[PDB]
């Protein structure tokens, strides 16, 4: 009944999805093909005959911008199109870092950006390009787009993990941010496929956390001797968790979720 | 020396291009490939072109309903296909002449109606409420990253062929009332040859690609009347389409012989149709 075609095997979310699909006992296969060409994708689909498809491909000179366009724009739009022609729900792993605190959603307010909102942080190429694709993907009834931010998981060896970035910085800033606890949200995303959810979902845990709060948990739970300094353009914001929370009332707030899925199992 | 790969034989400009290459003795070929990399990659190796022309659409105001199937259809060809084509050309060192739209700008506080102040290449599209408009702006902004691509902003394209329903003149001449707004416009008969020359000169970046100056719908209809049908009649509105002027400085500097709409209209469109 359930059969998953997944793109991005050499990737963080891609790999974790594979391991998730073992322990869940779900049939899955990693897309051999390349997003850059439609021929590949059509083949994979017709060969694998998937019920759902997952896109975890992806996450500035010309060469690297062009490369990103080829995979994040052309490629993502092509997969979306094919999956639509075929009737397949496409889970599209994307970014929430296209918003930033502003006059209508001020730092410290509790008012988060909603799914329906216009991306207000689009100066950087990556940010703009990500906003462009998200806007375009709205016209694809089958696509479900997930706004992931500053992904964190239970494994601190991962240089991509946000906690291990912050515990490395010389000085750090202290700004509350919406973040994605992978261990919790990734099983949730799989459930979203099963329920055939589509549209945009902010895909962070509800509530916000700052670097100081995360470094405090880090010192207490995993290195009691740890020390950091504070400062006496990146994205900072809250995403509104309402829509994702309505569909998934078991979803945990960040601190509470950092404690269970990340810090308690790494205690030392 | 020259060998052109052209996309869009189906369409207005793409058809016109082919005829110009015939008339000028330039070897050209229309691409079989659907804008499917491998399909395009095949064309480039089969044709071994010196330059590539993307007229894959759409010539002018298009043009149907904006439902999902229709929006998606433009995204597949005008976004993913155009970006795929630009990519392959860039990898291969090939210059790509991309025919596109100027109808992504609108009269504003800093470029007011009647001011003679026109939008520049560098300017940020300010008319992007509608899907088509936002989408073409997106692609245009993205194409800025492909140094081999030459984006041309064509507005309300016009031909000496007054029988062609795509021609802006015959649209307006066939309508009951009309809006009368000064606009920048493109005389294909004059401007299409120039685009062949831009390719020859390996030009790149964005060019506003309308004739210098503006005409209103009325100034045009009056010329229709005195040149083709003196018995012609029309009323106005007393009561959203893109209305703007496009700065022609950059195109004129590169092409001094470029004429303004009115004189270009007279010479290319109306006089050889008396
Ligand atoms: Cl708002
Ligand atoms: Cl400006
Ligand atoms: Zn680089
Ligand atoms: Zn980020
Ligand atoms: Zn809001
Ligand atoms: Zn137009
Ligand atoms: Zn200006
Ligand atoms: Zn280069």
**What is the C-alpha separation between A33 and A46, in angstroms, rounded?**
12
Question: Following DSSP, what letter does each residue of chain B receive, concatenated?
Answer: --EEEEE-TTSHHHHHHHHHHHHHT-EEEE--S---HHHHHHHHHHH--SEEEE--S--SS--S---HHHHHHHIIIIIIIHHHHHHHHHHTT-EEEEEEESTT---BTTB-TTS---B-TTSPP---SSHHHHHHHHHHHHHTT-TTEEEEEE-S-B-S-TT-TTSHHHHHHHSSEE----B---BHHHHHHHHHHHHHTT--EEEE-S-SS-B-HHHHHHHHHHHT-TT---EE---------B--HHHHHH-TTPPPHHHHIIIIIIGGG-
Q: Which residues contact A103 (CB under 8 A, 6 or more apart)?
A: none
**Residue in the block written with tokens 């083709």:** B228
Q: A-contacting residues of B 89-108, CB under 8 Å?
A: 90
Cβ count within 10 A of residue A183: 18
Report which of B104, B63, B71, B54 is spatially closest to residue A77, judged by C-alpha positions: B71
CA of A22 to the centre of ligand 3 (A): 36
Give the pair of three-digit tokens for residue B43: 């064309």
Report the C-alpha gap between B148 and B95 in whole angstroms: 5
CA separation for the pair B4, B47 (Å, rounded)? 8
The token duo for B121 is 């290449």
> Which are the contacts of A267, defined by CB distance < 8 A and separation ≥ 6?
A221, A222
Token digits of residue B11: 């369409």
Asked if B207 and B251 count as a contact pair (C-beta separation under 8 A), the reply is yes
- Binding residue ranges of A for NADPH: 12-13, 58-59, 93
Residue A195 phi, psi (nearest 5):
-75, 0
Partners of B235 in beta bridges: B177
Give the Cβ contact number of residue A246 at 10 Å. 9
Task: Choose the mutation target among B34, B68, B138 for the interface with A, i.e. most A CBs under 10 Å.
Answer: B138
Question: Which technique?
Answer: X-ray
* Measured CA angle at B123 (ends A103, B263), to 5 deg: 145
3-state class (DSSP) for residue A242:
helix
Instruction: Give the Cα-Cα-Cα angle A132, A136, A140 (nearest 5 degrees).
Output: 150
**B125 vs A132: CA distance, rounded Å:** 14
Which pair of structure tokens corresponds to residue B136?
A: 């073409």
Tokens matching residue B72 = 């998606």
Does A135 contact chain B (CB < 8 Å)? yes
Structure tokens at A76: 């993502």
Please list every residue in chain A followed by a chain break, i.e. its C lies more than 2.5 Å from the next written N.
Answer: 59, 232
Question: Which of B36, B138, B142 is facing A39, going by the closest CB pair?
Answer: B36
User: How far is residue A181's CA from residue A173's CA, in Å, rounded to a whole number?
Assistant: 21
Residue ranges of B for the binding site? Answer: 12-13, 57-59, 99
Cα–Cα separations (whole angstroms), residue A227 to A105, A172, A181, A217, B154: 32, 11, 24, 12, 60
Cα–Cα dist A208/A237, whole Å: 9
| Closest to A208 (Cα-Cα) out of A171, A167, A256 | A256
Burial B160-189 (b: 16+ CB within 10 A, else e): bbbebebbbbbbbbeeeebeebbbbbbbbb
Q: For residue B22, which of B6, B35, B34, B44 has the smallest C-alpha distance? A: B6
Q: Cα dist. A105→A130, A201, A236 in Å?
A: 21, 18, 11
Best residue in A36, A60, A67, A132 for a mutation probing chain B (most B CBs within 10 Å): A132
Residue A102 parent element (H or E): none
Resolution limit, Å: 2.7
Distance CA A118, CA A114 (A): 9
Q: Name the helix (H) or strand (E) containing A133.
A: helix A125-137
- Best of B35, B68, B72 to substitute, by most chain A Cβ atoms within 10 angstroms, is B72
Closest CA to A109 of A207, A243, A253, A215: A207
Domains of chain B plus CATH, in order, are 1-274 (3.40.50.720)
A62–B contact, CB cutoff 8 A = yes
> Are the C-beta atoms of B60 and B11 separated by less than 8 Å?
no
Question: Which residues does B183 contact at the CB level (< 8 Å), separation at least 6?
Answer: B155, B156, B214, B215, B216, B243, B244, B245
Return left, alpha or beta for A4; rule: phi > 0 is left, psi -120 to 50 is alpha, else beta.
beta
Tell me the Cα Rg of chain B: 18
Phi and psi angles of residue B112, each rounded to the nearest 5 degrees, phi first: -75, 155
* Chain-chain contact of B72 with A65 (C-beta, under 8 angstroms): no
How many of the other CB atoms lie within 10 Å of CB of A60? Answer: 11
How far the first Cα of chain A sits from its last, in Å, is 42
Give chain A's count of helices (H) and strands (E): 10, 8
Nearest to A82 by CA among B7, B8, B36: B36
Asked if residue B132 lies in contact with residue B66, where contact means CB atoms within 8 angstroms, the answer is: yes
H or E element: which one contains A67? helix A62-68
Query: C-alpha distances in angstroms, B208 versus A161, B151, B185, B221?
Result: 46, 8, 10, 25
Count how many Cα atoms sit within 13 Å of the Cα of residue A210 in the half-sphere of its side chain: 11
Beta carbons of A165 and A110 less than 8 angstroms apart:
no
Contacts 24+ apart (CB under 8 A), A106-111: A107/A175, A107/A176, A107/A236, A108/A176, A109/A238, A110/A238, A111/A238, A111/A240
Could you tell me which residues are beta bridge partners of residue A144? A91, A199
Contact status, residue A69 vs residue B145, Cβ threshold 8 Å: yes
Q: How many CB atoms lie within 10 A of CB B68?
A: 12
Give the minimum alpha-carbon distance from A177 to chain B in angstroms, rounded to a whole number.
Answer: 29
Nearest C-alpha neighbor of A115 from the set A245, A258, A257: A245
Q: Which strand (E) or helix (H) includes residue A89?
A: strand A89-95
């Amino acid at each position: 009944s359930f059969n998953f075609l997944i793109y991005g095997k050499t990737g963080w979310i891609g790999g974790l999805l594979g391991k998730l699909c073992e322990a869940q006992g779900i049939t899955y296969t990693y897309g051999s093909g390349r997003l850059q060409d439609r021929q590949s994708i059509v083949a994979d689909i017709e060969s694998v005959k998937p019920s759902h498809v997952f896109n975890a491909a992806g996450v500035w000179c010309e060469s690297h911008k062009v490369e990103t366009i080829r995979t994040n724009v052309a490629g993502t739009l092509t997969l979306a199109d094919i999956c639509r022609e075929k009737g397949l729900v496409l889970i599209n792993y994307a970014t929430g870092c296209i918003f930033e605190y502003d006059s209508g959603h001020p730092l410290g307010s509790g008012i988060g950006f909603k799914e329906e909102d216009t991306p207000n942080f689009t100066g950087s190429f990556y940010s703009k390009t990500k906003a462009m694709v998200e806007e375009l993907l709205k016209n694809y009834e089958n696509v479900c787009t997930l706004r992931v931010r500053m992904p964190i998981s239970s494994d601190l060896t991962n240089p991509r993990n946000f906690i291990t970035k912050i515990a490395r910085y010389e000085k750090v800033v202290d700004i509350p941010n919406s973040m994605t606890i992978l261990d919790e949200l990734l099983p949730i995303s799989i459930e979203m496929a099963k329920r055939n959810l589509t549209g945009i979902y902010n895909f962070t845990n509800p509530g916000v956390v700052s670097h100081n709060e995360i470094l405090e948990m880090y010192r207490d739970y995993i290195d009691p001797s740890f020390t950091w300094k504070n400062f006496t353009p990146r994205s900072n914001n809250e995403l509104d968790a309402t829509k994702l929370k309505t569909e998934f009332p078991e979803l945990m707030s960040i601190k509470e979720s950092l404690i269970k899925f990340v810090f308690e199992p790494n205690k030392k």
